[PDB]
Design a protein around this ligand. Sequence first.
Ligand code: NAG
Ligand code: NAG
Ligand code: NAG
Ligand code: NAG
Ligand code: NAG
Ligand code: NAG
Ligand code: NAG
Ligand code: NAG
Ligand code: CA
Ligand code: CA
Lengths: 468, 469, 459
Amino acid sequence: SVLRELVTYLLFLIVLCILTYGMMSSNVYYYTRMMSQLFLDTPVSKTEKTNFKTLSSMEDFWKFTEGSLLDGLYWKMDNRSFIFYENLLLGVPRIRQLRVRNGSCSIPQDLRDEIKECYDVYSVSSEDRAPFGPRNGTAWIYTSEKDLNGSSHWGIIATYSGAGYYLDLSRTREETAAQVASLKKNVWLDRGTRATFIDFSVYNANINLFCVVRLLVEFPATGGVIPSWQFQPLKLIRYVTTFDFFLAACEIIFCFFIFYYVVEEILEIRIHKLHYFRSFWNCLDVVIVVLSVVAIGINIYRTSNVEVLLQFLEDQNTFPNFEHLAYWQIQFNNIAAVTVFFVWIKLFKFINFNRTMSQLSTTMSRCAKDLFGFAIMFFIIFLAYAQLAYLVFGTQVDDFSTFQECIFTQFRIILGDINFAEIEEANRVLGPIYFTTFVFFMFFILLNMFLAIINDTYSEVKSDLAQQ
Amino acid sequence: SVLRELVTYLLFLIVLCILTYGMMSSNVYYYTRMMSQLFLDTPVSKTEKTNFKTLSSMEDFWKFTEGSLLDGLYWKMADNRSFIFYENLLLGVPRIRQLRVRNGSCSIPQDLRDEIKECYDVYSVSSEDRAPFGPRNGTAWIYTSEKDLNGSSHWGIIATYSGAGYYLDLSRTREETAAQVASLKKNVWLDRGTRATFIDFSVYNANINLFCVVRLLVEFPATGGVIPSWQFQPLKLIRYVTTFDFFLAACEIIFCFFIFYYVVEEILEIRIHKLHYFRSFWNCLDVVIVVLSVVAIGINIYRTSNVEVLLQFLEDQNTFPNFEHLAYWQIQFNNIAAVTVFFVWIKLFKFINFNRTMSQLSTTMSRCAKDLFGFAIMFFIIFLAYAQLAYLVFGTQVDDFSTFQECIFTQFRIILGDINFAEIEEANRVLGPIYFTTFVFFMFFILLNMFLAIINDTYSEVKSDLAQQ
Amino acid sequence: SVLRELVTYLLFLIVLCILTYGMMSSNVYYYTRMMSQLFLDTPVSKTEKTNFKTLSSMEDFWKFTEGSLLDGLYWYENLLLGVPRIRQLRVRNGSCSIPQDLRDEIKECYDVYSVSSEDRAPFGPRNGTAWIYTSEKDLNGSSHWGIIATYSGAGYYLDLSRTREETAAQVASLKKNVWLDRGTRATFIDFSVYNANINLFCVVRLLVEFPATGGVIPSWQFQPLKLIRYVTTFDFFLAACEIIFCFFIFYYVVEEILEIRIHKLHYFRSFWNCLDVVIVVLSVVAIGINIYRTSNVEVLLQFLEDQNTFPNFEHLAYWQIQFNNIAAVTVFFVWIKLFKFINFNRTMSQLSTTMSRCAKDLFGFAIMFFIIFLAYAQLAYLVFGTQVDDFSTFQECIFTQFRIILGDINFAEIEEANRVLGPIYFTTFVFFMFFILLNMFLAIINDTYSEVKSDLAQQ
Ligand SMILES: *[C@@H]1O[C@H](CO)[C@@H](O)[C@H](O)[C@H]1NC(C)=O
Ligand SMILES: *[C@@H]1O[C@H](CO)[C@@H](O)[C@H](O)[C@H]1NC(C)=O
Ligand SMILES: *[C@@H]1O[C@H](CO)[C@@H](O)[C@H](O)[C@H]1NC(C)=O
Ligand SMILES: *[C@@H]1O[C@H](CO)[C@@H](O)[C@H](O)[C@H]1NC(C)=O
Ligand SMILES: *[C@@H]1O[C@H](CO)[C@@H](O)[C@H](O)[C@H]1NC(C)=O
Ligand SMILES: *[C@@H]1O[C@H](CO)[C@@H](O)[C@H](O)[C@H]1NC(C)=O
Ligand SMILES: *[C@@H]1O[C@H](CO)[C@@H](O)[C@H](O)[C@H]1NC(C)=O
Ligand SMILES: *[C@H]1O[C@H](CO)[C@@H](O)[C@H](O)[C@H]1NC(C)=O
Ligand SMILES: [Ca+2]
Ligand SMILES: [Ca+2]
């Protein structure tokens, strides 16, 4: 009967919960919190109160590189560096830059007598590849992406490739400071500079968990500095304790469960009930199995390609390249979270033990087609308002900089989490009109219509069920 | 057929969306933000923490003029030009201007005609001063007419200021501008008769072809104090530089052709067939769209064809570039285009009837609109009663109720819960809590639920009628 | 016949209200707030801008114990009730397994705190009791249930002196002969104050947690307690109110015993009897806590005059916190109990019948709502677990979602942590909770109401 599928699903849910609990080691948050506090919040020097989060010019960047960055990276107990007497610095950090070439744009002939140099926004088509400055070392010669073992990044202004002009720093402060001073003397960040990256990693042998740090600074063509950061914890020496073997056994059991589910679905689609996509539960099951096999493939691909870590161990005086592992770890985490959410949602298939739950399920299922139909209208109006807000406030308020940001801001307005001190001053007319009309139409019309649909559907289904 | 109208509307929507996405190019928001932070968030000097946004006295204005303004305007690389971020080229020279009133322009009572000798009224063209004052040397001490200055009104916060006044053109280097400002400060140029002050300039930033016009206004009300305001407006005056610009021009021509076709079709449909034609609510939307589109087209044509200011500036680049009319018309065009796009997107409801689910929803909305209007009349009458009570009671102490429209917006924010109850509780110990409690109670317990009652009754009636029939 | 019940309940309610108002203005919150500002707000030293609320390293703690702690403790102008105690909990070297892949550069490891990995060997100069492990039994302490772990009552302890010139010397000696090694995991500081200006005893406990990943985490608790005595007439009035409350609860419990003896076969179908028994058990446990506190309050004044001994007074603070928590829910339930009298009219009867006839459907829908809630909470925990600190633990995720329901979003950390799947989570949660699910509740009630009125017609 149904007991077989119920107990199978319960076992699957239990093993899934164990897997997520194991992959969610306790108090990993504090590790990244301390690292980010050390490298992000300390002022660049003892004189001014500027940190990495509030950089505003190239001079501030040079101060940070020679200031708090070296104070954080190098600690005193070629002796190794322990970040907090616990976090060992692996290899050497690397600093890279991406720049455009002079003449990427065309100055209008009207002003072609007072302006000589123009530089376009960053793009792979219009990036520089020629040597500059004292063309002697690595930092002054372009290196291709393939020869650098790099990939794209998808920053804030644009998406930057993995090539550029790079330099590997040293294991001691006395040499890194000299290298950065030499880079500062012979001008390295010119008007053509568009992006800069600083990468390193730490281990913290106390808990088997690496940490990869990447800091990015963007120089827009209109002047200024935009900073960004990324701290990512990883695990690459998995099998060290008994709990690790337990988690491996759980992963094997999960793979067996996925194989059983997919073979059952294949046998149920192959012959019996051809084109059985008329049920919501079947679509949920196929979505679950697709996400699960994608996650399994990602884990298999990213668990055997640890050649970078193996290579690093032989020569511990080089730069360890752990960016691909971090990217795939993030992707795997996203996929696993979505899969867990859908597996939990699947529990509704079995909660029909009495009349009340069955009635609630019936009224929830029967209104699923009117709610979608009205959601189409609701989102049409929502997107019209969002586009109007984007066009009106798109250059002054910073909550309407992008279309998606406009959508998120409109969703936050419902909760009552907006300023309105900037909306009114950005545009004194047509600013308040938008806000007032949006509030009136969302709160007094559309929500009441959702409520009316739900009320009518529930009453009708209950009355007809009782009558029959 | 309906398919022809649908495909024509989709083509029109695609062209319009292309226009909007092209008009918002790469992030000029950062372009505006860098200048705003440079000129507004910078403290006027090292030891004090006041900036342009928190000016509180005339001495603070003088500190700002000789302080952060000169620091931001002039940057170091014979009489070389200034690049604000090594990228934004300062165009010509900045200009400063002031508007003041006459002495004895008010009427004081005879009772206090001994302890009070001088009096200056509020700003008005009837009360403004036109006579030389102080060391009458140049244009800074002589009235200049609006026509001779090529200016216009502004519509500031307190009043609407004219385009005339006493003006001075600064220099291209910091050393000369500093001396000029010091001379203006020594000989008293800002008295208590001063009513408004303007600072204007522009930059180019050749990297992306986009000018920027900067205007800063400081108002001195007759009751004392200082009110600052600002305006940073990006512009595009050398459009045809790249192939994307030609693509946008072609799309604009296609848009004009679409508008012509739509107006021709509207004239054909209003000519003889359905002479009344106004009882559809879709014909009204169509004529509104056409009117807005033709207004936008006219504004664009009148704006792009009047660029002699740019040529005059390019003839001699040691003079003030006069670019405020272009910014004003750009703002007007932006507003018109935004409203037109909103209504065009709203027009999509004419075609979403592909099954029985959407038909009944649209029927419910159309049937309940006539009752929603009738109840909204009462709702808005009560809303305005509360707003006027708040304006008359808290309107002189809170500043969230200082103006009637501000009271309306404050009530709409109170609905969302974005209010500070303590600031109105202390303004009036009684009648404040009464106001807040009664407003919240009668807004969330009575007025909000009647809309639900009407909508639920209409939806149930429509659905039952359809099912029974 | 219900007139006697209504009048006795009205007297009980007014007695409880006057007792609450007596507890309402105890003016203990303000003293504790401005005494916390004395320790957790003043800069650690004249040059550094940091305080106890913003400790970030071992050096900051070492500067705190020689500085803002000492100057603010020996000088509002409160006096000590003995000697403060400082205790340390540490782990042992080699408590975890270093992987063989990279072990030629790492020699020692220190696992997170646990009873299994706790250290007990005498480290440093074996002079006194600060360098030798003493079991929990001799310390007369219990667990603390900290932020990252729960800590035992044992460890390496040292009692300071009543004179600043000697306590400073002791802590300087502790700093010189290194006491906070890499194995240190937690540090406790405990003391008590009187502040004779306004009679209010206070017990102060401060904790610094050293994670295995480096850094420090501070936490604090200040708890006030009183030595109430018959010094006026108002305190006598409250004493008479307390005796009246005891008589009232005895009355309620004896007649509850009678009513359960006459109808023991069925006693749980009615809802008001369950509320009544909850009220009486809460009242009896609260009064037991109060009598224990007032019986044991006679021992604390022995250390007031002069005593070079540490008073362990954490149980009183814990039970006082529990007493306040119990009193709040007691008055709430004794405010709800008021709802069974207002049922005088026909409209009130219809409303009560509507509310009573839809309890099972509301409970049934609560299960589905909580299933979806837990699914969303687990998704948020998996996505934002290591970045936002509002989702660091599962209960934090649950409470953050509850706050989101009441409109308490931040959305800055959420957006920064994950540029995709963060905004998706926020938008989907808001749309599906503010437009679909939470409405269903009302729908249920709505239908029931209609049905009720309908049968009136048929009646
Ligand atoms: C950039 O190119 C222009 C001509 O294309 C040249 O005049 C100018 O000197 C160049 N800039 C530099 C820094 O070499
Ligand atoms: C470039 O060449 C070498 C680096 O390989 C260095 O010794 C030399 O000083 C450099 N020239 C400069 C910095 O001008
Ligand atoms: C890229 O990886 C290869 C090994 O696959 C290595 O030899 C080379 O040095 C790397 N390039 C760098 C570190 O720039
Ligand atoms: C303003 O005019 C009054 C007479 O109406 C005169 O007494 C006063 O001195 C004048 N103030 C000036 C000129 O500043
Ligand atoms: C007016 O101009 C003359 C000559 O340009 C100058 O010497 C004087 O300082 C100026 N200011 C006066 C007279 O107040
Ligand atoms: C911890 O124990 C290991 C055992 O191999 C030893 O090598 C190491 O020196 C010890 N740590 C200290 C600080 O002595
Ligand atoms: C430990 O030794 C003696 C105890 O006899 C004590 O006086 C001294 O200060 C302590 N520390 C040392 C000797 O470093
Ligand atoms: C705790 O009480 C016991 C009583 O047996 C006493 O011996 C001990 O000294 C007290 N605490 C301390 C200081 O260990
Ligand atoms: Ca299935
Ligand atoms: Ca038409």
